[PDB]
# Entry
Amino acid sequence: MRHYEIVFMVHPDQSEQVPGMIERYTAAITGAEGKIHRLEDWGRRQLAYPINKLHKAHYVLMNVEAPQEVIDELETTFRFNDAVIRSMVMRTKHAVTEAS
Amino acid sequence: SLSTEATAKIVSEFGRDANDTGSTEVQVALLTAQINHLQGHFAEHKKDHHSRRGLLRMVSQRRKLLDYLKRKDVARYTRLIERLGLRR
Amino acid sequence: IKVRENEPFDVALRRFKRSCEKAGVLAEVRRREFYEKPTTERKRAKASAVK
Amino acid sequence: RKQVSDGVAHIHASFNNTIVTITDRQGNALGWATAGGSGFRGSRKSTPFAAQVAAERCADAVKEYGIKNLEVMVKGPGPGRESTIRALNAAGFRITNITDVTPIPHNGCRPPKKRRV
Amino acid sequence: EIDYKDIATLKNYITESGKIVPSRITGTRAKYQRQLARAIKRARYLSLLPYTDRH
RNA sequence: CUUGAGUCUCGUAGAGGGGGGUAGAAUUCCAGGUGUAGCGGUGAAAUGCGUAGAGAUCUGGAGGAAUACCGGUGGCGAAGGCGGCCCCCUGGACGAAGACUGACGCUCAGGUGCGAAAGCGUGGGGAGCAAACAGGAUUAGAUACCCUGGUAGUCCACGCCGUAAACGAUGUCGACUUGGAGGUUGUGCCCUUGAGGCGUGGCUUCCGGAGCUAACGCGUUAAGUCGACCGCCUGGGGAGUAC
# Structure
């Protein structure tokens, strides 16, 4: 498989869904013969610019390792989900853990 | 390019011994794979020329090797062209 | 570019931001573009910067 | 007769002319000036000391309220990016923040070929 | 440096305009300059850092 | 047989290519608020736009093209060319311990393929720019330069056309031959205590010695000393024209 690192920022007034969103994704990854060696909840915070309006959003990281196939399934559930304002996921670059 | 679990795999199928990544029988066969595999890639995109240049490279480069075998051991040639379904 | 100071006075601080953009990358546009004229004059003016 | 108290002032600094409008906080026109309308026209304007007399004319149309303080919005290059702010500092107005709102793209549209003599 | 979360060690390589500081006044071994800029770009999407300044 | 050439391993840098996403700045336009007699343009002017309310300003929306800064005397590519961030498919280059094959190589008429821009066909798209065209100005005249507009086109797909000062105006491959300063990227090593210091490869700038050259100049990336193969020249015009 190939490592990853996805940081999704969900709408500020939908934070309560963030915790639930994590379980789904995480569960899938685990059920995809993958691994999760990084995780952190940044919560709400001011933005550089009012990206997609407002001036704050909920941040979360990841840095998985699951097979590209199953992660490509994420872009869909990510797009078709007004909760999440912006999506941004880079490639492997070898397992990343702690710090951040 | 090609995956190790495949490259280091095939080498142990045509090599007249062990870890003989040099052997024509090996190298040559190793070329067909990356070639056949790319044919599915070039089926898409098409306009991607800079990648075909390398494709053609390994193709002619493969032929340069086939001619050699014929000029070093007639048998080995016809004995390998089959295992690779070459000539077409 | 963002100024702001206590104690009313028209000192300046303004020409501080006048070193990153300002009337430069402005007139840079102004008229037409460049295309080949730059890649060339940009690589000739470089020769100047030698001595 | 509204008494905006404080409102930013846009300084459309251009070459062939310069104009400053003392708009309100939200961005409503309260009083605008103009070099072309400042006696001298043709092209005699432009020059800084010519725009200063223009924007200063606002303190005659926007003075009906009582602007006790105001910011400054300088846009575009030309002889009127400094002059304006100066004349305003003497007119009696205050100041809250100076800034350049000149439209600096990222290689978007392709500017006009133009000029070639 | 190869990231964007390290927003802490980036505000130094910019200015009141959030513009990527040149390598002239940095001499950041070049190879690093390349990486340093790449971060400031992608990092701006996560609103971690600003693009311009007027907005 | 192994040093040429190639394979394997593990790393490294890259605007190499094809596909799909996505972001921010700006322009234009549509709508509405504020506000009022100018705006725009030039050397001046005028056409043009303005009291049916422009310009300015602010809020919301639509759309297309290109990606400031980083950006460099930088990098990648056979050439043409290739700059936002992200993912997917993919090519080449280089270094190092090495392990492997064993001359499998160099060049290449004909042949096949790739080719800036402009142009062509079908269908899309169209913000800005702009051949044509139309006004205004300049002038002796002005079928121009300048100004106000503006259509093809520029953008996308797919197919065609094959040209360029397609330029290093310098064919590809290999071996030799004083030096100096620098750039970029790999690797070994050094109280690795450091920005760092010493080597050893790749690519690349500038100066320059011998030599070469008609001179300018080229000068280890040669236009120097040699070897292998290919393309080409034989006065100017007529003519890259006629058939």
In short: Chains E and B do not touch (no CB pair under 8 Å). Residues 13-14, 17-24, 27, 30-31, 33-34, 36-38, 40-45, 51-52, 54-55 of chain E lie near RNA strand F (CB under 10 Å from a C1').
